[PDB]
Write a protein that binds this ligand. Structure first.
Ligand SMILES: CC(C)CCC[C@@H](C)[C@H]1CC[C@H]2[C@@H]3CC=C4C[C@@H](O)CC[C@]4(C)[C@H]3CC[C@]12C
Ligand SMILES: CC(C)CCC[C@@H](C)[C@H]1CC[C@H]2[C@@H]3CC=C4C[C@@H](O)CC[C@]4(C)[C@H]3CC[C@]12C
Ligand SMILES: CCCCCCCC/C=C/CCCCCCCC(=O)OC[C@H](O)CO
Ligand SMILES: CCCCCCCC/C=C/CCCCCCCC(=O)OC[C@H](O)CO
Ligand SMILES: CCCCCCCC/C=C\CCCCCCCC(=O)OC[C@H](O)CO
Ligand SMILES: [Zn+2]
Lengths: 127, 73, 421
């Protein structure tokens, strides 16, 4: 089947810059809308970014709009979320999921409250 | 084969009133024909005519011709 | 002494015989091939889906029985001795049984498509087979007085006129003219006129071609049968003594009967092109077997999708937004991301349902004809059923299935949710 694997983490104080690398294992993810969501220890889930099959669609959160940067790449079937200017609020276990909501036609436009199905084990970003 | 479009060679439109018994030389039953039974009477003038078979004067003319048509008998 | 002398046809027959033999071979060549491909297309690796398919095969079977007699008749023309008195009648039997059956099913095509469009009366496959039996029985019992009288007299197989009354060939032509032409042409004309007058104002995206297809059926029927029946009319007028007829006129009328007869035999070669091979579905199917800025018209609005845990149930709903009257079947298709489109549930308006092997026993498809709605109850859902479900609709006569929905997402798994804000 399709299973996701994220391999971006580390321990950096506020101001650092990490790269969240999410690779697809089993299916080339040219066809799914993949997005990032985090969950700090003791808090509820929350999404931070989202990218789709269509070239123009993109989504970011209110508290991270501009600080992060997501981008798709067919090389090794891996999307990337470049975390720049980290804050203590970003201290959370990030997960890489595939959004299966709001498919208007042909492509999965990224959607609010999108159900995720194939997500990895998670990465720890300590800030 | 649809009707009336079959391959018949002889068709009679009207029958003769009467043929004198001394003018006919031969009668041939229709080898092939479309309409009802029709007898072809050949006169001494070598001209063909249609004749109805169910007639009193045609029946005896078929007995006179057939008897005299038998070659050397 | 002079009166009407026998009118000879020896030269007319000698000039017409090669044309008849040629056309017989042409009709036998294309008629057998064209009608085999019809049966092959609707049976080979595929079940009969609609009532139209039943009548198409039965129409091709009647044409087959007709064209398979032509090589027997060709041996008859080349030498009259070849046919005895007992095969002729039997061989003549196959001509009228197949001829009347061909006209019976042609009439049934219009009727079946008449009651479906205007009266919304749909026939399941099971019922179409039953009517085909009735028509075959009706075609035999109505042909009895047409071939049982043909015997071999004076080495020519001919209608035995001596054992019948003089009124018989007149009645036989009148019955054949109105029974085989007037009545069939009146039914298929009235039916296709009523149908064309409804489709032309509907919102179907093939209303144009539907009318053109139905007009061709009527036009081809006329341009192939009318010359024969119009020659019988002037021939019946001749027998009826209403008009005069010289010898020359009977010779022209004889040749016309022979020529127009061979013309009417070509109509059974065109039946595959008039009903079956005019629809795109049969065109695409034959290929896969022969081995080589605004919205438009009616759009299918879908609703009823969503997310549910494994073992739940969902109800997909699909309906036509516009007013279209030529849809005879609808179904559901799905496409998982990165996989091909597969059929999961198809139902016709007649009632015959068709499910996939993996799905049968879990999903239940239902429809509503008055609303042109189709519902799919998806019970006992599995994680493997996660795909985008598309709705499809098929159209009659034109045999098009280019009515698709936008596609709804159905995900069955132990998913995770993350509200983005
Ligand atoms: C669209 C249809 C009519 C196609 C036209 C076919 C033509 C060839 C048909 C239509 C009417 C037919 C004619 C009807 C009447 C007769 C009179 C007869 O003494 C000779 C044959 C003849 C003359 C037929 C010949 C064939 C004919 C002229
Ligand atoms: C599709 C087209 C080619 C069909 C045309 C029909 C043609 C082939 C047939 C139909 C009726 C036939 C005509 C009817 C009767 C006669 C009178 C005869 O003394 C000469 C031949 C002639 C004139 C025939 C010639 C060919 C004919 C006109
Ligand atoms: C002179 C003695 C008789 C002469 C006989 C000449 C040969 C007859 C052959 C006919 C071809 C038959 C073609 C096949 C017809 C069956 C088509 C079919 O598959 O059946 C339809 C189906 O059953 C519907 O539901
Ligand atoms: C061997 C002899 C060769 C002779 C070859 C003759 C072939 C032409 C067919 C004529 C009758 C069938 C006509 C079919 C009528 C359909 C018209 C139709 O559907 O219109 C097309 C549509 O508008 C756009 O696709
Ligand atoms: C001069 C002699 C001329 C002879 C001319 C013969 C014309 C034959 C026409 C019709 C008879 C067929 C009658 C068939 C009746 C079937 C009724 C039936 O099956 O009912 C279906 C029901 O209506 C579901 O809609
Ligand atoms: Zn004498």
């Amino acid at each position: 089947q399709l299973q996701l694997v994220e391999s971006g983490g580390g321990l950096v104080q506020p101001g650092g810059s990490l790269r969240l690398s999410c690779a697809a294992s089993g299916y080339s993810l040219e066809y799914y809308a993949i997005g990032w969501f985090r969950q700090a220890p003791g808090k509820e889930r929350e999404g931070v970014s989202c990218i789709s099959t269509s070239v123009g669609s993109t989504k970011y959160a209110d508290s991270v709009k501009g600080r992060f940067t997501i981008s798709r790449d067919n090389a090794k079937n891996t999307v990337y979320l470049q975390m720049n200017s980290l804050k203590p609020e970003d201290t959370a276990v990030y997960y890489c999921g595939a959004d299966l909501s709001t498919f208007y036609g042909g492509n999965y436009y990224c959607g609010d409250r999108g159900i995720y199905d194939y997500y990895g084990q998670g990465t720890q970003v300590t800030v | 084969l649809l009707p009336h479009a079959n391959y018949c060679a002889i068709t009679c439109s009207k029958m003769t009133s009467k043929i004198p018994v001394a003018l006919l030389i031969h009668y041939q039953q229709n080898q092939a024909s479309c309409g009802k039974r029709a007898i072809i009477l050949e006169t001494r003038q070598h001209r063909l005519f249609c004749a109805d078979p169910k007639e009193q004067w045609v029946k005896d003319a078929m007995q006179h011709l057939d008897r005299q048509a038998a070659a050397l008998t | 002494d002079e009166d009407a002398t026998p009118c000879v046809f020896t030269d007319v027959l000698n000039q017409s015989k090669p044309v008849t033999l040629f056309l017989y071979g042409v009709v036998f060549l294309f008629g057998s091939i064209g009608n085999f491909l019809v049966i092959f297309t609707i049976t080979w690796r595929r079940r009969i889906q609609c009532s139209g398919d039943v009548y198409f095969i039965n129409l091709a079977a009647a044409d087959l029985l007709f064209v398979c007699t032509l090589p027997l008749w060709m041996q008859y023309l080349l030498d009259h001795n070849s046919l005895a008195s007992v095969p002729c009648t039997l061989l003549t039997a196959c001509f009228y049984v197949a001829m009347f059956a061909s006209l019976c099913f042609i009439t049934e095509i219009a009727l079946d498509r008449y009651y479906a469009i205007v009266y919304m009366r749909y026939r399941p496959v099971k019922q179409a087979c039953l009517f085909s039996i009735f028509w075959w029985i009706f075609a035999v019992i109505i042909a009895i007085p047409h071939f049982m009288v043909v015997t071999k007299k004076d080495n020519q197989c001919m209608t035995d006129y001596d054992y019948l009354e003089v009124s018989y060939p007149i009645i036989l032509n009148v019955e054949l003219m109105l029974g085989a032409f007037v009545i069939p042409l009146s039914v298929i004309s009235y039916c296709y006129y009523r149908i064309s007058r409804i489709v032309a104002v509907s919102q179907s995206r093939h209303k144009g071609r539907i009318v053109r297809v139905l007009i061709a059926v009527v036009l081809v029927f006329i341009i192939f049968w009318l010359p024969y029946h119009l020659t019988l009319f002037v021939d019946t007028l001749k027998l009826l003594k209403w008009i005069s007829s010289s010898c020359e006129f009977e010779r022209s009328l004889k040749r016309a009967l022979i020529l127009t007869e061979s013309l009417a035999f070509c109509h059974c070669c065109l039946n595959p092109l008039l009903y079956v091979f005019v629809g795109t579905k049969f065109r695409q199917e034959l290929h896969c077997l022969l081995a080589e800025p605004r919205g438009s018209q009616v759009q299918l609005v879908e609703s009823g999708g969503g997310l549910v845990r494994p073992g739940g149930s969902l109800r997909l709903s699909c309906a036509a937004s516009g007013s279209i009257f030529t849809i005879y079947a609808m179904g559901w298709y799905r496409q998982a991301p990165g996989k091909q489109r597969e059929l999961v549930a198809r139902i016709t308006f007649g009632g015959d349902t068709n499910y996939a092997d993996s799905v049968k026993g879990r999903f239940t498809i239902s429809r509503d004809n008055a609303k042109n709605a189709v519902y799919l109850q998806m019970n006992s859902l599995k994680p493997e059923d996660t795909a985008v479900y598309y709705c499809n609709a098929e159209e009659t006569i034109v045999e098009e299935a280019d009515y698709w929905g936008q596609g709804t997402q159905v995900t069955v798994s132990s998913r995770a949710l993350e509200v983005l804000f």
